[PDB]
Design a protein around this ligand. Structure first.
Ligand SMILES: NCCc1c[nH]c2ccc(O)cc12
Length: 380
């Protein structure tokens, strides 16, 4: 229930000329913590002008849990020279083999004001090897033009490593898209990809979001994807959710890896009213799924072994009046539970939402057992 972590009023960069960018325009949408390396990676998409590094890192060795060091400066990704090696990213994910995966969407989202400095190209899935220094690029796959479908609306993704003890090449990537209610599926082995749509990937009712005493609204599809326990053949449930929704589905990875196959998603089925979340994370050690919620100022949980999913089977692991718009959640290598808010929901002009407390908030609960103790997500 204790947390350690970081808080920023503004995301400032180390070794970047002061004044050559506006620190309020640096908006982080996602993170990934490498527990073995004591490294934190932050996605800062090039949504607004003058973002020096779209993949940014901080060394948490000094800082984490140390009084006075709550706002580390962002650094260039150690695997990069200039900052132009990735154009714009929304989400970093670390797999079972300590490969750092990002999805370069391939263009910036503003016009003029230095946009020429970041020339466009086709969306790419890119991976860096954290095991080797200093983080060499080991995967670079471009989307075939036939499959591009609004890359700016890519949400969470999952990296499915069939052979975590081999060369780690039998690997699937499922990337959510919250506009199209779509999953883009990438077969790393075959070097092939395809898009899949399902009525299940779509928004239910619009999500309600309170800012500055008013009620705003957004309508997002799938956002929204995490991987469960493998069976002896290497298939697993892939849990997903739409942002604007309270229902949770799973679909087997078996049906996902089959290009042109029918999908048979199972309802699970719902978390109760107004608990919309855009991010969810499955923990292998407790079998709990954690939700970083949009408007409730909370992080919630559901043990996957308690069926069916009703509200009565969920609880709260974190509450903070300052946790405005949960935007990312993952569990790390040493079973750390990380969750992030940034007061940046998918609503027109949300970049200019301002708060009396630090906008960017990243917390860790030391382990998932610590989290769920004395709660309906326990055992028992
Ligand atoms: N808080 C930023 C909203 C957002 C837009 N796209 C995203 C992708 C991943 C994510 O965690 C969040 C987002």
């Amino acid at each position: 229930a204790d947390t350690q972590g970081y808080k920023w009023k503004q995301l400032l960069y180390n070794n970047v000329t002061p004044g050559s960018y506006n620190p309020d325009n640096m908006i982080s949408t996602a993170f990934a913590y490498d527990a073995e390396g004591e490294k934190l990676f932050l996605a800062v998409p090039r949504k607004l002008p003058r973002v020096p590094y779209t993949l940014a890192e901080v060394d948490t060795k000094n800082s984490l849990g140390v009084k006075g060091k709550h706002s580390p400066l962002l650094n260039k990704f150690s695997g990069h020279k200039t900052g132009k090696e990735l154009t714009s990213i929304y989400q970093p994910v670390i797999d079972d083999c300590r490969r750092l995966w990002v999805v370069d969407i391939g263009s910036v989202e503003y016009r003029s004001r230095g946009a020429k400095d970041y020339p466009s190209h086709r969306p790419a899935i890119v991976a860096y090897d954290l095991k080797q220094p200093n983080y060499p690029e080991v995967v670079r796959y471009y989307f075939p033009t036939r499959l591009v479908e609004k890359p700016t609306y890519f949400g969470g993704f999952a990296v499915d490593v069939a052979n975590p003890k081999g060369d780690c090449s039998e690997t699937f990537v499922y990337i959510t898209n919250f506009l199209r209610g779509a999953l883009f599926i990438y077969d790393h082995k075959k070097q092939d990809s395809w898009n899949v749509t399902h009525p299940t990937f779509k928004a239910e009712r619009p999500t309600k979001f309170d800012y500055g005493g008013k009620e705003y609204e957004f309508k997002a599809g799938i956002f929204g994807i995490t991987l469960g326990d493998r069976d002896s053949e290497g298939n697993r449930p892939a849990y997903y959710l739409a942002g604007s929704a309270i229902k949770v589905y799973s679909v087997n990875t078996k049906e996902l890896k089959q290009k042109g196959g029918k999908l048979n998603p199972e309802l699970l089925g719902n978390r109760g009213k107004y608990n919309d979340a855009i991010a969810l994370a499955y923990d292998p050690k407790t079998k709990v799924i954690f939700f970083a919620e949009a408007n409730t100022k909370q992080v919630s949980c559901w043990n996957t072994q308690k069926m069916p999913l009703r509200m009565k089977n969920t609880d709260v692991v974190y509450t903070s009046s300052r946790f405005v718009f949960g935007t990312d959640i993952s569990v790390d290598s040493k079973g750390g539970l990380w969750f992030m808010s940034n007061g940046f929901p998918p609503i027109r002009k949300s970049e200019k939402f301002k708060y009396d407390f630090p906008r960017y908030r990243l917390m860790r609960i030391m382990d998932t057992q610590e989290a769920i103790a004395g709660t309906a997500c326990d055992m028992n």
